[PDB]
Write an enzyme that holds these catalytic residues in place. Structure first.
Site, PDB file in Angstrom:
ATOM      1  N   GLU A 205      30.055  80.477 137.651  1.00 45.95           N
ATOM      2  CA  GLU A 205      28.754  80.709 137.041  1.00 45.95           C
ATOM      3  C   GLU A 205      27.844  79.481 137.099  1.00 45.95           C
ATOM      4  OE1 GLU A 205      29.501  82.151 133.070  1.00 45.95           O
ATOM      5  OE2 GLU A 205      30.190  84.119 133.779  1.00 45.95           O
ATOM      6  N   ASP A 319      31.678  91.343 123.009  1.00 46.24           N
ATOM      7  CA  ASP A 319      31.729  91.559 124.451  1.00 46.24           C
ATOM      8  C   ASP A 319      32.874  92.523 124.755  1.00 46.24           C
ATOM      9  OD1 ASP A 319      31.793  91.474 127.234  1.00 46.24           O
ATOM     10  OD2 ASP A 319      32.762  89.495 127.297  1.00 46.24           O
TER      11      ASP A 319
END
Length: 433
Positions: A205, A319
Site C-alpha cells: 500500500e 472492517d
C-alpha cells in the site's frame, strides 16, 4: 441507443502482479465503460467470493480465466439488451443469475467488474462525471483521507501487533492541501528512516514497515515526521489512526488477544476487557482519531464495551467485523457496536448493495469509509463513490505507488471540477462523534 450491446471481460494484473480481471461495456451509441476489480481476501463464509482458477501451474492458481468466461458466456448474454442506466435492475439480475448468497458461482469479481463497467458506461453515455451519476446533484464532500504510513502485524518483521498506522490531515482546508500535508509528512518520515538506517522500501500500500523497537517507537516516529514537516499533531493538523486487525492475533480457543504472536514472548496476552483498556491507554497517550478492528471479528460484547468506553471520543471502524454486509451492520447498529464501517466494494460485489450498505450506515449515524484492497489497479472508482455519497472519508493507501496515488489524483480532479462547490470537512467529517 442507451442499450447495452457488448459486455467483455479479460484477464489483467493487479498492483501485486497477481491476476484479476476487467470488464468493458458498450452501448449502441458507443458509450464506453471499463471496470477493473481489486483483489479480495476472504475472512469468513459471509462475504462475496472472488472466483479463482485454482490451476497451480499458472499464476500459482490465482488466474481468473473462469470469472472472465462467466462474464463472456453467462453474464454478457443476460445483461446485453438492458438500458445502460438501469444500474439496480442490472445488479439484481446478476445476483439472481448467480443465485448463491456469496456470489460464488459466477464469482464476485466477475459480477463487480460488470457492475462498475455499466455504471461508468452510463456516466459516459450521459456525459456526466461518475460521482454525479452515482450520487445525483448534491455531491460535494471531498473525503478526509486516512493514509497508511507505517505497517506492522504480518506486513512487517517489527515487534508490533497492529497492521496499519495511518495519518489523517483533519486540519487542512481543502483536499488538495490535505494531500500535500500527507505527502510532506510521508517524505519527512522517509528521511527520518534513512537517518536511522531503517528500510525505506515500501509495502503493498506504499507505506514503510521499518524495524522499529515496538508500537510506541512507531507512533513517536510518526509524530516526529509530523513535526518535521511543520504541522500540528491534533485536531488542528494531523491525527493518527489504527488498523489493529486484532482478529489476526485473537486466540479463538482461549478468547484472548495474544500479542506474543507479533511482538515476541515478552508480549502481553490480553482479555477483551484488557484489550479495551490498552486501546484507551493509547487514545489518552496519543492524538488518535480512528481505530479499526480493535476487537475480534466475532467478539461482539468486546466490541460493545469498546464502543461504550471510547465510542464518543473515537471513531471505531468495523472492517472484518462487518465485511461490507448489511446483515452484520444491522446487528452492530442494534447492539451499539462500533460507529463506523469499512466499505470494500468487492466484499459485497455490486454497486447497488455497496450503496445500500453506505446508506444503512449513515442512517444509523455511522460513517462509511470507502476502502482500497491490497491488490489494486489503475482504477479510481472508489474516489467517485466517496464523493458521490458525500461519505467524508476514504482509506486508499500511503503516498507512493500509483495503485494508491491514482485515487488521490482522481480526487484532485473531482475537487477541481466542483470548484467553489467543493467541501472538505476535516474533523467535521466525524458526524459519528
Amino acid at each position: 441507443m442507451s442499450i447495452i450491446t457488448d459486455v467483455y471481460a479479460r484477464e489483467v494484473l493487479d498492483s501485486r502482479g497477481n491476476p484479476t480481471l476487467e470488464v468493458e461495456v458498450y452501448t449502441e451509441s458507443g458509450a464506453f465503460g471499463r471496470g477493473m476489480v481489486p483483489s479480495g481476501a476472504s475472512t469468513g463464509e459471509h462475504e462475496a467470493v472472488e472466483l479463482r482458477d485454482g490451476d497451480k501451474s499458472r499464476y500459482l492458481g490465482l488466474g481468473t480465466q473462469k470469472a472472465v468466461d462467466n462474464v463472456n458466456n453467462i453474464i454478457a448474454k443476460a445483461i446485453i439488451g438492458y438500458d445502460v442506466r438501469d444500474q439496480q435492475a442490472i445488479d439484481r439480475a446478476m445476483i439472481a443469475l448467480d443465485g448463491t448468497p456469496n456470489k460464488g458461482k459466477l464469482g464476485a469479481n466477475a459480477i463487480l467488474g460488470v457492475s462498475i463497467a455499466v455504471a461508468r458506461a452510463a456516466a459516459d453515455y450521459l456525459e456526466v462525471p461518475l460521482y454525479t451519476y452515482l450520487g445525483g446533484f448534491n455531491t460535494k464532500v471531498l473525503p478526509t483521507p486516512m493514509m497508511n504510513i507505517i505497517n506492522g502485524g504480518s506486513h512487517s518483521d517489527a515487534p508490533i501487533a497492529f497492521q496499519e498506522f495511518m495519518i489523517m490531515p483533519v486540519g487542512a482546508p481543502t483536499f488538495k492541501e490535505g494531500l500535500r500535508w500527507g505527502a510532506e509528512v510521508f517524505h519527512a518520515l522517509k528521511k527520518i528512516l534513512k537517518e536511522r538506517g531503517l528500510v525505506t522500501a515500501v509495502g503493498d500500500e506504499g507505506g514503510f514497515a521499518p524495524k522499529f523497537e515496538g508500537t510506541e517507537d512507531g507512533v513517536e516516529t510518526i509524530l516526529k515526521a509530523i513535526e518535521a514537516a511543520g504541522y500540528e499533531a491534533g485536531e488542528n493538523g494531523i491525527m493518527i489512526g489504527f488498523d489493529c486487525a486484532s482478529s489476526e492475533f485473537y486466540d479463538k480457543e482461549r478468547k484472548v488477544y495474544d500479542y506474543t504472536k507479533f511482538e515476541g514472548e515478552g508480549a502481553a496476552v490480553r482479555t477483551s476487557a484488557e484489550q479495551v483498556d490498552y486501546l484507551e491507554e493509547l487514545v489518552n497517550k496519543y492524538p488518535i482519531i480512528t481505530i479499526e478492528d480493535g476487537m475480534d471479528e466475532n467478539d461482539w460484547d468486546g466490541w460493545k464495551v469498546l464502543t461504550e468506553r471510547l465510542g464518543k471520543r473515537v471513531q471505531l471502524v468495523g472492517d472484518d467485523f462487518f465485511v461490507t454486509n448489511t446483515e452484520y451492520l444491522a446487528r452492530g447498529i442494534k447492539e451499539n457496536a462500533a460507529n463506523s464501517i469499512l466499505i470494500k466494494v468487492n466484499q459485497i460485489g455490486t454497486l447497488t448493495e455497496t450503496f445500500e450498505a453506505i446508506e444503512m450506515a449513515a442512517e444509523a449515524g455511522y460513517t462509511a469509509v470507502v476502502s482500497h484492497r491490497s491488490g489494486e489497479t489503475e482504477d479510481s472508482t472508489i474516489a467517485d463513490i466517496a464523493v458521490a455519497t458525500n461519505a467524508g472519508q476514504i482509506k486508499t493507501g500511503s503516498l507512493s505507488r500509483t495503485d494508491r496515488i491514482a485515487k488521490y489524483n482522481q480526487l484532485l480532479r473531482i475537487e477541481d471540477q466542483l470548484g467553489e462547490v467543493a467541501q472538505y470537512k476535516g474533523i467535521k467529517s466525524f458526524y459519528n462523534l
